[PDB]
Design a protein around this ligand. Structure first.
Ligand SMILES: */C=C\C(=O)N[C@H]1CCN(c2ccc(C(N)=O)c(Nc3ccc(C(=O)NC(C)(C)C)cc3)n2)C1
Length: 252
């Protein structure tokens, strides 16, 4: 086994989350993703997994290794007991305060600032691809994984992606703004009354999402800044983080 390879004999399966919760060597909690035959460009993914092993940030779901000697192959990651952020936001029982919503934004922004510092694009950032752990901390998952998939996220894409397929750091910025909108809307579908086709037209005509009721003006300004028509006029993740911290200090 190489350092990116986990022996599946070390796994104990505990329940279904295909994705399962289990233990590695009896003691360490893991999530186990079973990669369906024909769904993934597996040799390309394996090569990338070696790089992904070295990404490490507290707000990034950790990749522990892969099991590639049999099929289906397994992806072994940090266990996130409260599941996907989208579903979490939609549970009305939580009765979230806006400070909790702003902290979810900050968690993601810190992960994305880290990926940006490593010149790594997420390519599909959205609440459905963030996870929540047992302490309520949100982390970014599935970063980069769309490249190995053999349902396009129109509603999280900037004009230049829709028109020209121009992906960049600034397309991740645009997506982050839509994710803030998802958080502050408690998990509403962006452009909820429109189809994907209608959304692409709306965006290209220069129109945008509007302010969630739970977002203050200052929070709306931050998400809206991610949607500049000109990619180069959108902020970096480092700037977004500074903006979010400033609002946390002001709205405390
Ligand atoms: C909103 C999208 C979604 O439902 N995604 C599913 C596909 C991938 N999923 C996934 C991936 C990785 C993990 C992990 N690292 O732990 C998890 N974890 C997970 C999922 C669901 C639940 C759960 O259902 N919790 C409640 C409280 C019963 C709702 C817990 C942990 N999931 C999920």
């Amino acid at each position: 086994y190489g350092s990116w390879e986990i022996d599946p004999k070390d796994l104990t399966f505990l329940k279904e989350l295909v994705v399962k919760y289990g233990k590695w060597r009896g003691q360490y909690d893991v999530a186990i993703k079973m990669i369906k035959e024909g769904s993934m460009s597996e040799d390309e993914f394996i090569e990338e997994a070696k790089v992904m092993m070295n990404l490490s940030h507290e707000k990034l779901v950790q990749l522990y290794g892969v099991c590639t000697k049999q099929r289906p192959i397994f992806i072994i990651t940090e266990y996130m007991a409260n599941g996907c952020l989208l579903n979490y936001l939609r549970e009305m029982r939580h009765r979230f305060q806006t400070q909790q919503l702003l902290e979810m934004c900050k968690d993601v922004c810190e992960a994305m600032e880290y990926l940006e510092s490593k010149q790594f694009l997420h390519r599909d950032l959205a609440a459905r691809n963030c996870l929540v752990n047992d302490q309520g901390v949100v982390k970014v998952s599935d970063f980069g994984l769309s490249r190995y998939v053999l349902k396009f996220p129109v509603r999280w894409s900037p004009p230049e992606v829709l028109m020209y397929s121009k992906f960049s750091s600034k397309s991740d910025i645009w997506a982050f703004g839509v994710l803030m909108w998802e958080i502050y809307s408690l998990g509403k579908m962006p452009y909820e009354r429109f189809t994907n086709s209608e959304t692409a037209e709306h965006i290209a005509q220069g129109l945008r999402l509007y302010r969630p009721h739970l977002a203050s003006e200052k929070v709306y300004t931050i998400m809206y800044s991610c949607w500049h028509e000109k990619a180069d006029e959108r902020p970096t993740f480092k700037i977004l983080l500074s903006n979010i911290l400033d609002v946390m200090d002001e709205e405390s």
